[PDB]
């Protein structure tokens, strides 16, 4: 239904080890489609999804020339950051940039994004109105005033409201097969005894796209968020994801526990229990 495109920039300064590294990655929803790395022998934007390959060499060149300029900008943005914080050339610092667009089922833009970070901390972000800035610290306020003076917000709003929606709409139709089709998780419950009086019940979800999923454990239908161990959703490497939730159960209470899986692929939220007969 709702879709998003975001670009992630990472500019890391390495002293004495040459030019700071610039890595740019592009995501449509939970799928990566493009990448760039300055450390590559022949830096070029490269395709990381099959549907993006349809594009013209001209498109690739455009992406490639944009990334080269952006790396040069953030290399000098890294040295400007040194001045703002009065930091030495000897240290290693990172600039991270995230910008992107949220669209609804229609594909009209819902939200516009642009957050900048310095050394893993919030630095400056474009506000929801797409006309104003939020600064984390006094150093970002210096950058904020420059961006107000140079009318930077006007260009980002133009890109977010137009070029981003038009390319995101295009990617969603070119990869309509992969991007807009939802793989449901395949689910089962496994039993692992800890001891003779205690055991672990594990609820499994595998091979589901998109990554968003809800795994919950209920005992007699009462929720157990306190006592559930929930792991981060992780990739399987085939562009699908896995997740599991575990609870530690006294022997003989296993049937009281139930697992509920919610996903976009599922018609109805499933309810599961341990089936040792099979």
């Amino acid at each position: 239904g709702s879709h998003s495109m975001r670009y992630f920039y990472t500019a890391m300064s390495r002293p004495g080890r040459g030019e700071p590294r610039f890595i740019a990655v592009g995501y449509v929803d939970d799928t990566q489609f493009v990448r760039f790395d300055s450390d590559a022998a022949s830096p070029r934007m490269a395709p990381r999804a099959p549907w993006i390959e349809q594009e013209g060499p001209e498109y690739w060149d455009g992406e490639t020339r944009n990334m080269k300029a952006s790396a040069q900008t953030y290399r000098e943005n890294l040295r400007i950051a040194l001045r703002y914080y009065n930091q030495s050339e000897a240290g290693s610092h990172i600039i991270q940039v995230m910008y992107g667009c949220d669209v609804g089922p229609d594909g009209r833009l819902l939200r516009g994004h642009d957050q900048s970070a310095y050394d893993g901390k919030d630095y400056i972000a474009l506000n929801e109105d797409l006309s104003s800035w939020t600064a984390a610290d006094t150093a970002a306020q210096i950058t904020q005033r420059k961006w107000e003076a140079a009318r930077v917000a006007e260009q980002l709003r133009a890109y977010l409201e137009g070029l981003c929606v038009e390319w995101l709409r295009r990617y969603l139709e070119n990869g309509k097969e992969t991007l807009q089709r939802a793989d449901p998780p395949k689910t089962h419950v496994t039993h692992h005894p800890i001891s003779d009086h205690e055991a672990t019940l594990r609820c499994w979800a595998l091979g589901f796209y998109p990554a968003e999923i809800t795994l919950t454990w209920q005992r007699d239908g009462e929720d157990q968020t306190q006592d559930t161990e929930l792991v981060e959703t992780r990739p399987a490497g085939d562009r699908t994801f896995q997740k599991w939730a575990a609870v530690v159960v006294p022997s003989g209470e296993e049937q009281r526990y139930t697992c509920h899986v919610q996903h976009e692929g599922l018609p109805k939220p499933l309810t599961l229990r341990w089936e040792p007969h099979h």
Partner: peptide, 10 residues
């Protein structure tokens, strides 16, 4: 371009 064309210095 799909990426943001504008270059802005901090």
């Amino acid at each position: 371009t799909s990426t943001l064309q504008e270059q802005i210095g901090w």
